[PDB]
Design a protein around this ligand. Sequence first.
Ligand SMILES: *P(=O)(=O)O[C]C([C])([C])[C]([O])C(=O)[N][C][C]C(=O)[N][C][C]S[C]([C]S(=O)(=O)[N][C][C]1O[C](N2[C]=NC3=C([N])N=[C]N=C32)[C]([O])[C]1[O])[C]1[C][C][C][N]1
Lengths: 503, 75
Amino acid sequence: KLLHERMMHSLARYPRQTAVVDEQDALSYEALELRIREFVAMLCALGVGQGQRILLWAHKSVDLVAVMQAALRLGVVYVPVDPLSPVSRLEKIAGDSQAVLVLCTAARLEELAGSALAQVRSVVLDDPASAGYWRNIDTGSSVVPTLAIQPDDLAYILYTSGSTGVPKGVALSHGNALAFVDWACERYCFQPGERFANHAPLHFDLSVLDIYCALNVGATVCLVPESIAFSPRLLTDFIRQHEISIWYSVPSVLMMMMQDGDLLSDIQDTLRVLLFAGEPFPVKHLRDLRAAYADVRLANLFGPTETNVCTAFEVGAIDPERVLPVPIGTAASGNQVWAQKPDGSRCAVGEEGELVVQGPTVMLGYFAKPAQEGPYKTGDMVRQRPDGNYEYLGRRDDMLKVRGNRIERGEVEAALLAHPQVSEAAVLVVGEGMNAQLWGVLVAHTRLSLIDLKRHCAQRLPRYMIIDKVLCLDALPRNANGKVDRFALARQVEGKLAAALEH
Amino acid sequence: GEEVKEKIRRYIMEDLIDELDDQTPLLEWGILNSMNIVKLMVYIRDEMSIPSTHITGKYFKDLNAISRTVEQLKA
Ligand SMILES: *P(=O)(=O)O[C]C([C])([C])[C]([O])C(=O)[N][C][C]C(=O)[N][C][C]S[C]([C]S(=O)(=O)[N][C][C]1O[C](N2[C]=NC3=C([N])N=[C]N=C32)[C]([O])[C]1[O])[C]1[C][C][C][N]1
């Protein structure tokens, strides 16, 4: 039944298969099982109990997958924190989750030392030399608690961009996870001995298909390492070397791999299932991928972290005359899904409305906030075609998407505002897709170099939320009501650029 | 060397983005990224050819690191 039990079922049937691979190391189900059991002894020796929070802040590794599974078994709540994100943002997530343990590398100890969570216990996963190395914790005088865990118990929290600059914790249960896993396993017919690439970092929910679907069916998950993120040819090499059958990423990555990594010239015969999510896929490029890989299964999976995948569309043949992205399709993960008019009523075929999700994947709620009650409103505008498939039209709020990344205007704005020589800030995106750029429009106290500002951003935000371009104004356009005129601001940034293509 | 380093520093500063130091971490501060790094290579080939095993922190960390990389590509 429960998440940790799916590994245990796989162990019994396949103890000698490779479970988890990283850039340095790999583990069989048996070796994973012993590593897990050793992390369980360690969490118990440390006094970390059911429902308490632990932070994972380190590059993806077989030890992280073991720690996740150790926490599940003790119903300890694990919080994957972006390892490419600075200590100041971990302090906010540490504050919000009120976590009692950090699991990091020995390199990260120095950052933690000066930080606000200096007084939180850390243990080193990587360097045996480090006084904080996890094996140095004595577990002899320690015992595994007697406890049971129900499908609705909090398993992990995936933090997301916060409009106030404090990130929000999507608190998710065994049942949330498993309704996705079981849905995907049945839908794409995942087999023992299949090899799953884990492209996404652990704090995104793409990673939950890669790791938990793999461990569910006695297959292998290969952690794509951070080091090869910007290298489309190393990414296609990873597919070849690990004989990858199942790939799951944002289309931006597949498109890098198609342009600068020979994915269409050097066919990867091992790929059986190609899953993409998180943003639209320019249909001209998706038509190419479909043609190269005629035999492969292609699907467009849709939803926020708060629902995981709530909708999906099987991409068969694509009309050559088609110009729009393919549908986001029909309900998934055993959810019911509908478009709402702003009054409450169901939209009818052809009527744009906001997508609503009722089902077993809908989050418990943002951690340390009031529970999700009833269906979840996604903020995503959609429209049903006659055949029953939804198309995504966009958002009406301050959640930006740059190449699949989710960025609250306010989180970047709060960072820029904290700059001593910045009195007003407003963030927006110029361009679509691969071209898209994140802009800061600032007013200076005493008239701000881009390099200085990037330095300033990088100390507070993940690099994917560091602004590409800056525009300094004497004041920000306002609306009658005093609020910043984001429509005016967009027109003025679009206008200044249009004047530079003319001059 | 110092000429190779300045044709780059000029390009970064002009055609992609003050002063940009030798050691200014180009990836940490998202000056170089998934979309602009392949452009800078278009240029370093088409007007000075970096291999795809090399598109990583080791090669493109600092300005002087991108300097060493082209310098060491002799024959
Ligand atoms: P560079 O420019 O230096 O690097 C580029 C590169 C390598 C792409 C880098 O940017 C990178 O590694 N990106 C990783 C991006 C990633 O893996 N993101 C995970 C997507 S997580 C998404 C949930 S969410 O809450 O973040 N966003 C939900 C939000 O997204 C929109 N959306 C979801 N799915 C779609 C589809 N299929 N079509 C259009 N829009 C979509 C919605 O607005 C939604 O509200 C995932 C996606 C499935 C489950 N959760």
